[PDB]
Write an enzyme that holds these catalytic residues in place. Structure first.
Site, short mmCIF file in Angstrom:
data_model
loop_
_atom_site.label_atom_id
_atom_site.label_comp_id
_atom_site.label_asym_id
_atom_site.label_seq_id
_atom_site.Cartn_x
_atom_site.Cartn_y
_atom_site.Cartn_z
N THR B 16 0.85 -1.19 0.00
CA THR B 16 0.00 0.00 0.00
C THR B 16 0.88 1.24 0.00
O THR B 16 0.43 2.30 -0.48
CB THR B 16 -1.02 -0.06 1.13
OG1 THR B 16 -1.81 -1.21 0.84
CG2 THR B 16 -1.90 1.15 1.26
N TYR B 29 -8.56 1.16 -3.62
CA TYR B 29 -7.23 1.34 -4.21
C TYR B 29 -6.66 0.00 -4.67
O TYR B 29 -7.23 -1.04 -4.42
CB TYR B 29 -6.35 2.03 -3.18
CG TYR B 29 -5.82 1.16 -2.08
CD1 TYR B 29 -6.56 0.97 -0.92
CD2 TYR B 29 -4.62 0.51 -2.20
CE1 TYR B 29 -6.12 0.17 0.11
CE2 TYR B 29 -4.18 -0.34 -1.19
CZ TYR B 29 -4.91 -0.50 -0.04
OH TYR B 29 -4.45 -1.28 0.98
N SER B 62 1.54 -7.54 -0.56
CA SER B 62 2.19 -8.55 0.32
C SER B 62 1.20 -9.65 0.69
O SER B 62 1.67 -10.70 1.20
CB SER B 62 2.82 -7.92 1.55
OG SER B 62 1.86 -7.65 2.58
N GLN B 63 -0.05 -9.54 0.32
CA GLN B 63 -0.97 -10.70 0.40
C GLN B 63 -0.52 -11.80 -0.54
O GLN B 63 -0.89 -12.95 -0.30
CB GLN B 63 -2.44 -10.35 0.19
CG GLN B 63 -2.82 -9.80 -1.16
CD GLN B 63 -2.76 -8.29 -1.24
OE1 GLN B 63 -1.83 -7.61 -0.78
NE2 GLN B 63 -3.81 -7.74 -1.81
N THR B 93 1.92 -4.17 4.22
CA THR B 93 1.74 -4.40 5.66
C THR B 93 1.18 -5.76 5.99
O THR B 93 1.46 -6.25 7.09
CB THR B 93 0.91 -3.30 6.31
OG1 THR B 93 -0.42 -3.38 5.77
CG2 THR B 93 1.54 -1.92 6.12
N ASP B 94 0.45 -6.38 5.11
CA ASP B 94 -0.32 -7.56 5.46
C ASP B 94 0.59 -8.71 5.92
O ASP B 94 0.21 -9.41 6.83
CB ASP B 94 -1.13 -8.03 4.25
CG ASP B 94 -2.28 -7.11 3.96
OD1 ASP B 94 -2.55 -6.14 4.76
OD2 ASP B 94 -2.99 -7.38 2.96
N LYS B 166 0.93 -7.18 13.08
CA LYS B 166 -0.13 -6.30 12.66
C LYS B 166 -1.35 -6.50 13.58
O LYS B 166 -1.98 -7.54 13.48
CB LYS B 166 -0.47 -6.51 11.18
CG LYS B 166 -1.50 -5.52 10.62
CD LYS B 166 -1.57 -5.59 9.08
CE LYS B 166 -2.48 -4.52 8.55
NZ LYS B 166 -2.51 -4.54 7.09
N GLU B 287 -2.01 -28.45 28.62
CA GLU B 287 -2.91 -29.60 28.42
C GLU B 287 -2.46 -30.62 27.40
O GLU B 287 -3.07 -31.68 27.28
CB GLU B 287 -4.31 -29.11 28.05
CG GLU B 287 -4.97 -28.24 29.10
CD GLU B 287 -6.30 -27.69 28.63
OE1 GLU B 287 -7.17 -28.48 28.24
OE2 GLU B 287 -6.47 -26.46 28.66
N1 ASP Z 1 -8.84 -25.74 27.66
C1 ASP Z 1 -9.65 -25.22 28.80
C2 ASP Z 1 -9.03 -23.82 29.09
C3 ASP Z 1 -9.78 -23.01 30.09
O1 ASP Z 1 -11.02 -23.29 30.36
O2 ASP Z 1 -9.09 -22.01 30.70
C4 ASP Z 1 -11.01 -25.07 28.19
O3 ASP Z 1 -11.30 -24.21 27.31
O4 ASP Z 1 -11.96 -25.87 28.50
N1 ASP Z 2 -2.63 -5.50 0.91
C1 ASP Z 2 -1.59 -4.42 1.10
C2 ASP Z 2 -1.93 -3.69 2.47
C3 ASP Z 2 -0.90 -2.66 2.93
O1 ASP Z 2 0.24 -2.68 2.44
O2 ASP Z 2 -1.26 -1.87 3.85
C4 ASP Z 2 -0.28 -5.15 1.13
O3 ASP Z 2 0.04 -5.84 2.15
O4 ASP Z 2 0.49 -5.11 0.13
#
Ligand code: ASP
Ligand code: ASP
Ligand code: ASP
Ligand code: ASP
Lengths: 319, 330, 319, 330
Positions: B16, B29, B62-63, B93-94, B166, B287
């Site tokens: 961008t 754009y 950059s996408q 930026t992406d 980002k 876990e």
């Molecule tokens: N993995 C657990 C994490 C939590 O509850 O803090 C759950 O989502 O059930």
């Molecule tokens: N899609 C653009 C967005 C940006 O640069 O802000 C890029 O990453 O090239």
């Protein structure tokens, strides 16, 4: 005259607040005897799972149970894992037609740990469910002394007790000394103001999520298309942007029976129209501030009503 | 004695920062459209601070960043290190956070390498690109910038390539080092550096891409309620070298995704647990018994960053214990 | 039929957006010719100052001018310095009785600097003032593509273009492509829902601010008491706490004709009742989420109505 | 060979960590009430990680912290450095950020010095104090903690004493290093340090309080619309050594405050411009000509922190140019 406390129903689903998903609802309630100062609490065990294994069947059970039991109680608290609390909360926000308080709560530390958060979190969730001012604000999440709306709330940190934040529009109120000063309410339509009615559904439309990054594979998106998914949400880069090969596959999907929503892997801000992608040309829908997992929730429910991208975009603009 | 300005090379890749639209006020754009000369001439103050040379490497959003552009950039900087005093890379930026970390692990040049972009296109009212480019050149020209790894300079802030990400879809202030913070702030063309990254970077890593034509295949799968195993199975069926899981919470996996990745790890696919959660580490000793399944915990690396390190790890080793050691050191 | 654009009045006060306070309103407007696509703009120069020298006389001028001119225009934009924008915004939030949009805007970089923010900030402030959905939300601040309520908004960083944030309750909406998606509105009473009427006042009650820290001097608080100040706001430590010698002086002040509000130097969260300080015993008022400078604004206006600490606390609970 | 645990000394000073109220659910409480023994015995896991000795230095709310307690603590740590392996200081949260920076500039002990408190009293439901104390002891016991200056350990995070500040009135997660970020995060009793402060601390400063009985008098004045000059005049009339201004924006002063402080600086009162704004530097080369008025810019030091460094600067010098150099190095 007799002083009367509200009747609050705890619907237990598991989570670390019961650790995940090991301790029963009775045991959780009895560990916080001060709940008796604020409510008459009754507990029911819906399921006892880690929320990393949350699924459509549990969502449908919970919505139908709250809608059925609305007139029997003054408010609901749902004990839940933190991992997908943000998803369950928004599903219930769109499908619950009870406008009595519905409050979700979990814990980042288990009950056995030093300085466990669960007891006070459960106390504050019952405070919130018992407060008449909590009604008509949609489904709520109460964590770390904060009342958060089900739409914007998200888990922002892997381990922090203060992880839950409404990252785009902020919290509804803060809890101090058993009282809430509510300064905000969500303007998006929720609960009885949505058309979503899951009372007779046993399943939901199949919606999957694909991730974008540098050199992204199109194989995940092709796998969902080959399985005839109803919808795909893209976790796009930046403002919902797609890697070229993913863009190619999703452009095909949208013209071949698969609803496509552009969301973002970026944790805050909207995925907008009118940037680099001509959504109308491709038949895509922009998710706004709905992150990929939340955009999935609304896309599943949209697909119960319509497959038309323009009508799906209007749903994404109202709920 | 005569004052001499540093020699700074701008390697342009698009973004961008090089975007244009037909209105200063409408949002619509196209990215990666304007050439490096036009960017340099939009910042006439640059001659106060450096002798600038611009090279157009590619001109893309950059996408659509890819492994080939990464290898081109690393090889070009390592080849040209002795010809210049510093580099600025104009980029979208992406995926800037991904390119920055790849270069942070593969650049062996000891001189400043600074990435910069813009959230508003070059044609927009109050476009951010010109001052961002000025500040990137300030940073690349400052001798105190050296030996801090590859940097991102955005919104008056110097950020390390490992932690920077980002955070917002649209805000000019989007780039933040959300776990460990920035290295320095820029005011009036001066930096007060108060931090440097402890994880090993640049000439302190073993990663040498000088003779690589390609990188190991590493894909990313998302976790959520009722997650499909079809994405994970598609990467396994294609013979991917590695898979990074964007887990829920502290790197947790929906059971059917867990099952697929457990089977893959047993066949030799490298599996890294990361998190869709935007801050905080995916830890060991929560876990998931990583040792049992042959999994690697990403720590503070988000899924796209963990992919970068996993691809480079797979150039050296397929052993999960050695890959976990890499994830503990870089 | 004829397509008609709203009439918007710019009231200029100075600030870096005019740098501070050097360039006239006409020059600011003419630098953004795209304003003509969205509004019929008229500019009036109220004052041309750095907001570090903002004062009660300018506040009273602005409130009376908006209240007087409400029926002549469709909306107002106030160009202002960033340093005390948060104070002016909340003063106007409590005293403006026009419920047509009133939007404040500034710039963190001067007009002459590379990538100056002022032009787009002014464009977006006029977008906001022209939007019918902006009415009845109180006085607004528009900065960095964000609509912020006058009560919660504050300057969070000394130099960042993104400095303005509503740190406790979040923004009201985000601006993209000349459109706002408003998801929130302030619940505290504002504008025509307050009793504050400054139409006939030429001065405001004298209210000063004292700071707390380790080994704090009581000399500043004694100086305000010796001058017969109407009110003192304490920038307390933590949850509005006071260094012992400051506490002694303010306890005297509150029993000797000086209203005392406990606020906090801490940048987010409420100064609550029911913690370490027995406000009722000492005759003090807790500021809630009002920071010291904002608590001063409301204490001055409270003192136009009442000197009673219990009535001042109720004002601090409603506005 | 036999495993030996580190010797850690807890210096207790009070705070909500030692607070009590009559209910687990009501907010009302009294700070600095419970003794160090009771705190230690509330964390029975501490014996897994250290041999703990508790000393009660004072038992006060940190809203009443003062220069005498600062001098006591610095002298005690510097005297006792060879008797222990590390120190933890239990303290109130309200002025922890001030005490931490004073100790960061005056402690000459090379061993870890960690400050800790609690946002909820010891009697409250889900009280934070026990795990905070455990994690503080973990940090003080970790050899990787040494040479990083005085630390604050709160909410599973290791923060440097210079940048750390209380950001929220009530939240357990209140402490953040808002400009440059934390040094490390604590998980399962282990720290992954990725940062260390660059500004000079501890044995790298010239500040030696070993023979001081008192500190220079430094007061703080607030700026806002229509600000009174009466606070500034009161400190000047009392012969204060220094005044720190909590300026608006980038350290700006309301004109009548500016006038008083300009006159004071001309008589020899040291004047530091800081900011009421909670993040970001008060810079040179903005709207105030510091050199002309004899003022000092605080940089990222907030008013209470700038007071700490100004008091210590005034032990060495009254010259504004030398005080600005101190503000650029510590
Ligand atoms: N993995 C657990 C994490 C939590 O509850 O803090 C759950 O989502 O059930
Ligand atoms: N899609 C653009 C967005 C940006 O640069 O802000 C890029 O990453 O090239
Ligand atoms: N000191 C200037 C700062 C600004 O406007 O950015 C003012 O408040 O008027
Ligand atoms: N006022 C108490 C607050 C706390 O410790 O949390 C103190 O600083 O001692």
């Amino acid at each position: 005259h007799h002083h009367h406390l509200p009747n609050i129903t705890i619907l237990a689903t598991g989570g670390t607040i019961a650790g995940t998903g090991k301790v029963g609802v009775e045991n959780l309630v009895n560990a916080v005897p001060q709940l008796k100062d604020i409510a008459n609490v009754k507990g029911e065990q819906v399921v006892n799972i880690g929320s990393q294994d949350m699924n459509d069947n549990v969502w449908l059970t919970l919505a139908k149970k709250i809608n059925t039991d609305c007139d029997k109680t003054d408010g609901f608290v749902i004990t839940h894992g933190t991992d997908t609390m943000e998803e369950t909360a928004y599903f219930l926000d769109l499908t619950v037609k009870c406008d009595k308080p519905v409050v979700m709560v979990g814990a980042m530390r288990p009950s056995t740990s030093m300085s466990a958060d669960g007891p006070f979190n459960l106390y504050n969730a019952v405070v919130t469910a018992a407060d008449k001012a909590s009604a008509n604000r949609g489904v709520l999440v109460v964590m770390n002394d904060t009342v958060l709306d089900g739409r914007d709330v998200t888990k922002t940190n892997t381990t922090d007790v203060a992880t839950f934040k409404s990252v785009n529009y902020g919290p509804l109120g803060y809890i101090h000394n058993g009282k809430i000063d509510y300064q905000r309410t969500p303007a998006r339509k929720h609960t009885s103001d949505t058309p979503f009615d899951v009372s007779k559904l046993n399943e939901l439309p199949k919606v999957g999520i694909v991730y974008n990054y540098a050199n992204a594979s199109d194989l995940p998106a092709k796998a969902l298309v080959d399985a005839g998914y109803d919808g795909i949400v893209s976790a796009g880069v930046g403002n919902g942007n797609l890697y070229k090969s993913v863009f190619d596959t999703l452009a095909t999907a949208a013209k071949t029976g698969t609803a496509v929503v552009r969301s973002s892997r970026v944790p805050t801000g909207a995925t907008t129209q009118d940037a680099e992608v001509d959504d109308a040309k491709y038949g895509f829908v922009a998710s706004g501030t709905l992150n990929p997992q939340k955009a999935r929730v609304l896309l599943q429910l949209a697909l119960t009503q319509t497959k038309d991208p323009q009508q799906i975009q209007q749903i994404f603009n109202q709920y």
